[model samples]
Target: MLILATLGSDKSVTTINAILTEIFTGLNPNKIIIFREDPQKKDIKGMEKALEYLGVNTLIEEKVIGEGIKLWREKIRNEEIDIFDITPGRKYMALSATYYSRAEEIRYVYLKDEREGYNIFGYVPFEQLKVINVRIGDEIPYDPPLTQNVNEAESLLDVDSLRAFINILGLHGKVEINGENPDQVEEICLFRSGKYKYEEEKDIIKEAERGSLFLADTNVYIRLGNRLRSLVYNRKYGFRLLSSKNTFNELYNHTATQKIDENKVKFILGMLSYRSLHVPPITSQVRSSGDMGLINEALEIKKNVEDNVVLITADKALGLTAQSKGLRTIILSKVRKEIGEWDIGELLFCLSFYNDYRRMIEISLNGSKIAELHSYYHLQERRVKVRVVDKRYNYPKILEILSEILATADQ
Candidate 1:
């Protein structure tokens, strides 16, 4: 495989090395072309030698921004390489590279170094934040990125501060933390402008008319749980509950090691009693279809059936996709899934408003301490920061406890 990256300014060559080492591992690219405006001899003369010390066959190139883009076009056009590392680049080079491969199958990656402390881990823990478009940290409701099993001797296990980033790789995708404050990313509007409807909570949450069909996303089960069942049972909107196989299967496969998760799934199962949920047509043989699959299924239902189909979800990205596909969607506020294991803030936010710190600290599973948490106001960032106060280091149990704490917060 060939890897294309840009190098300029103060970016260390190891940025590419880490991208290859951690993200790619054994699948290291044979040919790496570095695009930079700087003279390679003065800046990167010994760069190749340094990389050769590790026995990597590498190539460094000098290309103007336009030439770099043309090379990407040539390489991508001929299908030579699809992976581009925009982690280290001049703004314009990275910007154009991002657009050149925007929505198609080609994957461009950035080795996010905002939280370098995470690199001290023994085990690699990276989440799949790649779906579509450019999203800031606040714009989307995703668990933060974290690394696990860090070598504690070199770096303390406690987190002093945690940083997060979002991948805006999808077409017409934008997410921000502030409900209405995220500035629109004009790049995502590559399609005909003003055609797609990206609705907010106010637009998505509405009473389904009588005989309308409500499709459930996994998050619908996670956040609303049985409240959705009650709504349908009470005939509040005269709508019936429907679910897709992928969504159910995802919930079916949720982690269930500790009682917290087991009970949460139990509650979800109770809420989603097979009798209560109207099943959609079997769309696939595969078990786990992601948001895109769910979106397609909803579209297929709408295309075949005449009923007013509505998508119920707490995930902002899912809502965006459903609406983009012309499905009437009910997007509730955040009742995010507690699937993120390494994110300490994700846990703290759950117990934040409820003052459940006491409960969080004292909680354990099977007579063992789950884990401990220490949080304080960051002051500069004006947000609460959190760290895992762990000596026992329970991974699976911590996740279960994480779910339990979030479930408690939902109440």
Candidate 2:
């Protein structure tokens, strides 16, 4: 098996943990690949010496978002069972790696802090993840079809004017088509509420009346074109337009400003008719929400990948988010009751030895090498239940107890 880990500032933690776990469990990997950001390569070089001393075959590779994706895709061509440990890595690297693992049917793992100590929580099988396929494209310049019909006369309606126009609709109800002739029609002037019309508002109203936006006989009532109504109601032209880069330069440039030109508003309204057509489909599962971004995103990947996906995180909200969505989630904190917040590292140490004890029992049993003389030593269940004595004492000291048992058994 090949183990892939994303390196963090403290590189030794993950490496040492992985090496020791593998040694005890006998689930050894032929080689360990460390993904490091460009700036981290220097620190990672020093980290490599430590792994070398431990006799681990380690390879440290620099991480690049685009190129790294391409490389993973290439590697997937050859069918090999590889595992990804995402617990200790940069956010982007973690996200990308999670997606790639889901997309390509690779197993993944996470080292989580339990009450007893930190334990590797995964190696979740490929058969378990759900993968959802998506088509996301590169951003490019786009022109809305309606913008072509928006002559200079209609360009007088800016964002502020648009706001005023929306307010008018909100106050008086939806703008209706009430006339036949453009000159005699009831004109819906863009007026600010509770105040006399400003010169710009008056000018905008006059320009709007003369434009094709007005039905021939309209004066008091405004024509709510299908395109404009959709734009305003759906808010397709609102702040979400700013999320894209470079495609709509005028909107992109004006998005940062408190006020925008009338032409930009007109352009945005026109573009709203084809908002879905212009914008790229979101490939990641996670939406712009609170702390559940990564959880939801990874869940989305699993949903698309047509396999089972399990999520393991130190955060409770994240695990619950996954579980709510019908995805398997292992909340490390909940796996064991933590006595104190500061006791996390020590708790993990205890948990690791607990796992080591369990692995030892499994290995011995599976090998069919039973002890000739049955010395009946009561086996304590390795569970997260409230054991008063164990919970009463600190976790690091508990490790000493487990260690003594291991040494006694070895003798």
Which candidate has the highest lDDT of all?
1
The number of clashing residue pairs in each candidate reads 12, 39
Best candidate according to TM-score: 1
TM-scores for candidates 1 onward, in order: 0.28, 0.23
Distance from true location, Cα of 409 in model 1, Å: 34
After superposition, candidate 2 runs with Cα above 4 Å error: 1-24, 45-55, 63-81, 102-411
lDDT of each residue in 352-388, candidate 2, tens digit only: 2223332221101222321111011111211121111
TM-score of 2: 0.23
